[PDB]
C-alpha cells in the first residue's frame, strides 16, 4: 500500500511510518482538524488483530497513504494547483470522502488514479459519482 | 497480578508468560477444552489498547494467573486433594466460574483467598454464593 504525488514530472512516494519531514504530519494534523471543525467529519478507525490474546500488535486495515501525499502537496505546490495522486490499491471510502472535502475546503482539484479508476475531485464532488 | 498455590507448605508463584513447564499449559489447554466440551463454557476475551492507531500492542485485562496455578495443582497434587490458591487481586468473574466448574468436574475442593475474601469451591458451588 503506497501512493505517489506527481508535481510537473516530480514524483514522491508515500507509504505506511518513517516521516519525510515532521511538518508533513503536522500539516496533515491541521488539515484533518479542519475537516472535523468545519464540516464535522471524523474518519473510522479500522484494524485487525491476527490473534487477540496476549500481546499481539495492532495492524491497520487502511494505510491512508494518499492523505500524507495530499498534505505534502498542500505544502510544496502553490494555491489552486491540481494535486495528482496515484495509488496501487483501491481508494478506501473514508479517504475518498477525505479527498472530496479537501478539494472543496482548500479549493484545489485532485486527480487520483487508483487501482482501477480515475477520480477527479472538484468543489466537493468526484467524477466517479461515488460509485467505484 | 500473580497467584500462589500452597501444597503442604510448598508455595509456587504464577504470573503473566515464561512457562515453568510446557506441560502446565498443555494441562491447562486440556482442562479448558474439557469445560467447553462438557458444559459448553467459554470465557470472554477482554483487553485494552492504550492507543488503537498504528501498531500498538494488546494488553489483556485479566491475567488469569490462578488458572495456571490450578493446572499446576492438578499435575502435582493427587486426586481429591484440595487446591489452595492465593491471589493479591480480586478474582475475576470468569475465573470464579472457572473455579466452580473445575471443583465439580475434577472433584476437588478449591480454597481461594483473593484480595478480600475466602472462596471455598466444592461440587460446583462456592461459599461466597457468587457475591464478592
Ligand atoms: Zn484510506
Ligand atoms: Zn471518485
Ligand atoms: Zn480471571
Ligand atoms: Zn466465591
Author numbering:
A (entry chain A), B (entry chain A): 826 to 841, 845 to 960
Wording from the paper:
Finally, we obtained crystals of OTP86DYW belonging to space group C2 and diffracting to a resolution of 2.5 Å. The structure was solved by single-wavelength anomalous dispersion (SAD) phasing harnessing four zinc atoms (c for details). Remarkably, the deaminase fold of OTP86DYW is interrupted by an insertion of about 55 residues that bridge β-strand 2 and α-helix 2. We conclude that the OTP86DYW active site seems to have limited accessibility for sub-strate cytidines, which is conferred by an insertion (H837-G891), and we thus term this insertion gating domain. In OTP86DYW, the motif terminates with the DSW sequence and provides two ligands (C954, C956) for a second zinc ion (Zn2); two more ligands are part of the deaminase domain (H924 and H947), indicating that Zn2 only has a structural role within DYW domains. Notably, the surface charge distribution of OTP86DYW reveals a region of positively charged residues spanning across the active site and passing in between the base of the gating domain’s β-finger and the DYW motif. The inactive structure zinc coordination is maintained by coordinating H892, C920, C923 and a more distant water molecule, whereas the catalytically important E894 is ionically bonded to K915; K915 also hydrogen bonds to S828 and S893. In this configuration, the ion pair will reduce the basic character of E894 and hinder the required deprotonation of the deaminating water, which is not productively coordinated by Zn1 and also not contacted by E894. We reason that beyond the steric inhibition through the gating domain, K915 has to be released before efficient catalysis can occur. For example, the cytidine bound to MmCD causes steric clashes with the β-finger of the OTP86DYW gating domain when positioned in the active site of OTP86DYW.
